[PDB]
Design a protein around this ligand. Structure first.
Ligand code: H27
Ligand code: CA
Ligand code: CA
Ligand code: CA
Ligand code: ZN
Ligand code: ZN
Length: 157
């Protein structure tokens, strides 16, 4: 689908990378969802159920959906457009080193924020400073750009 047909979105962290403590991983995802909830009529509620709208997985190579990851670097993660089942789910390549991005590795917060963008129905931006730009660039500045917010309001008001 082009967008979620309900406003109360649920998510399930199905498994964890060992790269970061679980509480830090939980918080990275929470922060990434908080970014989008501030600018939408959507809420994001964590659940412990396979029935969740957005199922989150860490995996490597072929991990069960026919879109295999590729080892270190290259593809970092991917997420499916809104809908039932696999749709809306977000997967992270655990052959990457997940971090806070300041040091070595990729920021789990930034990559998750980007992927949740896709999971709400956004496509890519042509603005380098936008979160939904298709190349990863680590920044400590505010991730959202006018274009990101325009795109998400275009779908959700
Ligand atoms: C096709 C398309 O939509 N455009 C790009 C083109 O890249 C450009 C314009 O430079 C580029 O086209 C060219 C040649 O200029 C092309 C280059 O090829 C590769 C593989 O490097 O890449 C296209 N983009 C796609 S779709 N590539 C894959 C994407 N990733 C995923 C994603 O966008 O979520 C995707 C599988 C769903 S990614 O894993 O590589 C990725 C995952 C996450 C950030 C990310 C980003 C920001 C913040 C945090 C994170 C990035 C990238
Ligand atoms: Ca990879
Ligand atoms: Ca789903
Ligand atoms: Ca890893
Ligand atoms: Zn996948
Ligand atoms: Zn993307």
């Amino acid at each position: 689908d082009l967008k979620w047909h309900h406003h109360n979105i649920t998510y399930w962290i199905q498994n964890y990378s060992e790269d970061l403590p679980r509480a830090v991983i939980d918080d990275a995802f929470a922060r990434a969802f908080a970014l989008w909830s501030a600018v939408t009529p959507l809420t994001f509620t964590r659940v412990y159920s396979r029935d969740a709208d957005i199922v989150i997985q860490f995996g490597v190579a072929e991990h069960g959906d026919g879109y295999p990851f590729d080892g270190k670097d290259g593809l970092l993660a991917h997420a499916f457009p809104p809908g039932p089942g696999i749709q809306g789910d977000a997967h992270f390549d655990d052959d990457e080193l997940w971090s806070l991005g300041k040091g070595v590795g990729y920021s789990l917060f930034l990559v998750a924020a980007h992927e949740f963008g896709h999971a709400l129905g956004l496509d890519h931006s042509s603005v380098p400073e936008a979160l939904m730009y298709p190349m990863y660039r680590f920044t400590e500045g505010p991730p959202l750009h006018k274009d990101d917010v325009n795109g998400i309001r275009h779908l959700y008001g």
